[PDB]
Subunit: 80 residues, 3 copies
């Protein structure tokens, strides 16, 4: 009965040691993860697609502007 | 005394089993978190507000440009 | 032999208690980390440098436009 208990104590001490190592590993894994406080949520930042869409809109207005300028330069050349 | 020790062994084995489970859960939770290496910090990316402010400044220059163009088109029409 | 086992049970219960506390701490650390689902990967967002580069390109086209407009206004003034 007493030798029995001893073998169970050994089993428990091994498991505890294995657990302590798992916990050490877990801590290191946690330190490689980004904190809420350092990362931007999706609400707080635009995606690449959203930015592309806004840049596109600007690009179209720039093209409209350039076509109008070219048309004006032409009108002026005809006046001269 | 020996039955006492036995009841404590049972308690310990239950706690250990419960701990092992907790650790299994924890690992899975960790895998749903973003790594520092894959996420952008706040100083590496602009917020929506910061982007809005920069887009606004561009828009004001566009409005100035378009007013000037419209005005020029009118000056030309009057010349013709 | 039996008092020996008792002192080992105490030693084990202390380790278990210490482990439980480590796990409690770990859980709280995990809740301060950003979830993949709430953060943007680097693939999904532009950096400040990337945005600056795109803004700069727009600003250069705006400068070119404003110089052309000024030049045009002057040509028109000379015609009148």
């Amino acid at each position: 009965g007493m030798k029995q208990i001893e073998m169970k104590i050994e089993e428990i001490l091994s498991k505890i040691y294995h657990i302590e190592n798992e916990i050490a590993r877990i801590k290191k894994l946690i330190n490689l993860k980004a904190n809420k406080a350092d990362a931007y949520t999706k609400d707080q930042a635009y995606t690449k697609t959203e930015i592309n869409s806004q840049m596109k809109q600007i690009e179209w207005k720039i093209e409209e502007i350039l076509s109008k300028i070219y048309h004006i330069e032409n009108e002026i050349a005809r006046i001269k």
